[PDB]
Amino acid sequence: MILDTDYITEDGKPVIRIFKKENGEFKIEYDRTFEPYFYALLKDDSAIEEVKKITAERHGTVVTVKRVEKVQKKFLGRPVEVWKLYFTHPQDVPAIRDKIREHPAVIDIYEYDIPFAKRYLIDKGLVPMEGDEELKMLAFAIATLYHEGEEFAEGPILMISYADEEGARVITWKNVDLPYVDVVSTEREMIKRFLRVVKEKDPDVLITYNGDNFDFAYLKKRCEKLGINFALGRDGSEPKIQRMGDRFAVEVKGRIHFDLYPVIRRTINLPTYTLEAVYEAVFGQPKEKVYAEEITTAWETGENLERVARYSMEDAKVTYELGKEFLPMEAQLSRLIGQSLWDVSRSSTGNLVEWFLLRKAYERNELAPNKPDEKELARRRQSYEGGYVKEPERGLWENIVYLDFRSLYPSIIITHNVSPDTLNREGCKEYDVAPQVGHRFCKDFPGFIPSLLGDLLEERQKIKKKMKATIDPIERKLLDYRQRAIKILANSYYGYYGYARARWYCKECAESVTAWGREYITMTIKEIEEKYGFKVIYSDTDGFFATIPGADAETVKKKAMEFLKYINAKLPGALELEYEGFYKRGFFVTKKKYAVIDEEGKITTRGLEIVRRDWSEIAKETQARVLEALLKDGDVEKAVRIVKEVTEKLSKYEVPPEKLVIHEQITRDLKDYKATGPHVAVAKRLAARGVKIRPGTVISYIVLKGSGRIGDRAIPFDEFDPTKHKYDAEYYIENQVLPAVERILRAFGYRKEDLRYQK
DNA sequence: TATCAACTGTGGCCGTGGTC
DNA sequence: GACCACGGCCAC
Ligand SMILES: [Br-]
Ligand SMILES: [Br-]
């Protein structure tokens, strides 16, 4: 199984390293024969002799063109001839590529920004994470001595904890009376012990939670201060800390540093991504948090260190358990994209598509378009019309069906062959024509992207079939994750077409997809209304809710099935309308906000405050309770009594502050905010102190008693102390609970004053 | 100098704090 | 007091 590739330099020449795990053994294979290259399109082939002679310099070394070769490729399906320029060392490419492009006989260069070790994986046909090899994993976490206004890592590491299949231990340099704590004499001895643990255990995967941005940088600074070679790499190298945009990421050579935080962030939507929140949401058990201040107090006084050590043990334990839960899936995604787990687990959606496409482009001799320059990028910022959203007939309805398309946008791309290489391609014998926007697509040959998307969807169906039939539980599970990875990829193509930074950006493709989507969903709505007499209550993009007002449940179902038979005989190709489910009652509040209940009692909620992180739990819980009264018990008066009771509890300071926390994400640098709401006001105050705020940080705050600007009396919940603080009960009534439930009960005539407790 | 210069789409409702 | 831009994060 291939884990990763990189290169090193030996007598000036690049040596590719392929890090493998075959049959329980780590291996390094070396390749010295692979040459970096990129392509040049020339105005005339005789200019190659001038281009051959262009030179550059690299730390006092002269950079030359090693050799050239004229080659035939396809560019958006059409034949083209380019010169493949070869070089001795990958760092020659950035030293010389601009000078070659600037040459007047060079129209443009292509494929000049592909990291060499990834170029190697593609051109060699090599695929990481193939096979059933079992990887050895090890989670770790640290606890540190924090004081507020200090430089990063001015304080020592206090404990290092780790966990694997054998359990969890804690190394520390004070005496703690717990069986899983190993005691050494100093911080230095502790770090060296941990390094020895790693080297002896020899894990393939080091699992952290936010180790990209805290743990490794901390260890590095302490190792600098204490004179420690922190040699975690399997080749003896130290961890490699690199900047990727506004974030950091950390490699450990020969291993996979699997930082769960970016993975969980892509995978699950939670209000906060504390380790405690994540563990509870995935596994369903609490995890107690110990705060930095208590940790420091415990260390400075020697008191209650057992609680700190257990917290530290638990960080490592739950980090290992989460790593076991999330890694196999990220592994199948890496295999599908064809790049390393380290990269793929940190990568954005658009980047995964592009890496997949670059590899398939190589296999098909398709020259890759370049990323846009600053001018082109600014041109691409124009937008287009998206999905159809019908204004709901608002209120409570009974005996509802939801019908929606199977993978609407991918079905469209495939059925109508929507691709930049088919877009208005001249001279064909068959075209499909996108409604409203008018773009024609050639049907005579499969477009590059439709062809790949089609192969993907077909593979996913074969996999689902083999899963059902298989008898091997290991294979079944690998198949499950691969089928899940294909769905993710296949559903990413439409947004990639509209992605300004994409190489295969195609605005005409994207707006053709959405125009076809609008035509299909609105055509289908009109058919079920006109030909079967349904009322369409509400519809968003690819599906709709409908019933027959005065009508039995089995009547609505049967007639929905008849309409489906009728409609799918009219739909072309892969377009297919499906029966998603039957809901006994539904409550439609606005566009994109509604809730339904099924026959078994299960409520499903969309768009309402209940699902959002920027609404306090007390508001969410109460709206949830109002909805159940309506949907389940059809009991409006009980809904009012619930609100009245909740608002009275709040005015009596009987609601625990833990239900008053509001979570809002910082999304940019604090200086760039033009308007400052409460979460930014808090963020700015924390930055004022010793606290780094980066995009993606969730500010979790509570509003304290007062009047005027919310932001002047908001504090991080971390710091809430009921002996020093009084929460703003009128705010949680007037700004949180009542607005959330008024928007629902507005439909039955109740105004805010019918919902408040009376003094 | 040892690596991609950066984090997919549009449609929609809402709270805050500012202006007029 | 009426209005609105900014920014949050949802649905698909
Ligand atoms: Br499915
Ligand atoms: Br409560």
Numbering used by the authors: 1 to 759
What is the paper's account of this structure, in its own sentences?
Interestingly, Connolly and colleagues found that archaeal B‐family DNA polymerases have evolved a so called “read ahead” mechanism to sense uracil in the template strand, stalling DNA polymerase promoted DNA synthesis of nascent DNA before the deaminated nucleobase reaches the polymerase active site. Here we report on three new crystal structures of the archaeal B‐family DNA polymerase from Thermococcus kodakarensis (KOD) DNA polymerase in complex with primer and template strands that have extended single stranded DNA template 5’‐overhangs. These overhangs contain either the canonical nucleobases as well as uracil or hypoxanthine, respectively, and provide unprecedented structural insights into their recognition by archaeal B‐family DNA polymerases. The template overhang binds into a positively charged crevice between the N‐terminal and the exonuclease domain of the DNA polymerase.
[4f] To study this in our context we performed analogous crystallization experiments with a hypoxanthine‐containing 21 nt template. The experiments resulted in a binary complex with the p/t complex bound by the enzyme in an open state, characterized by an open finger domain and no substrate triphosphate bound. All single stranded nucleotides could be modelled, however, the single stranded nucleotides C+2, A+3 and A+4 show weaker electron density and hence more flexibility compared to the rest of the template and compared to the same positions in KOD‐U. These nucleotides may adopt different alternate conformations. The first single stranded nucleotide T+1 does not stack on the p/t duplex but is rotated to the side and the nucleobase is twisted by nearly 90° compared to the p/t duplex end. Again the backbone amide nitrogen atoms of Tyr37 and Ile114 interact with the exocyclic O6 and the ring N3 of hypoxanthine, respectively while a water molecule, that is bridged by hydrogen bonds to Glu111, Tyr37 and Arg119 interacts with the 1‐NH group. The B‐factors of hypoxanthine are lower compared to the neighboring nucleotides which speaks for a stabilization in the binding pocket. Superimposition of guanine on hypoxanthine reveals a clash of 2‐NH2 with the main chain oxygen of Glu111 (nearest distance around 2.2 Å) or the side chain of Ile114 (nearest distance around 2.7 Å) explaining guanine exclusion. The only significant difference is a water molecule which participates in hydrogen bonds to 3‐NH of uracil and 1‐NH of hypoxanthine. In KOD‐H, the water molecule is displaced by 0.9 Å to accommodate the bigger nucleobase.
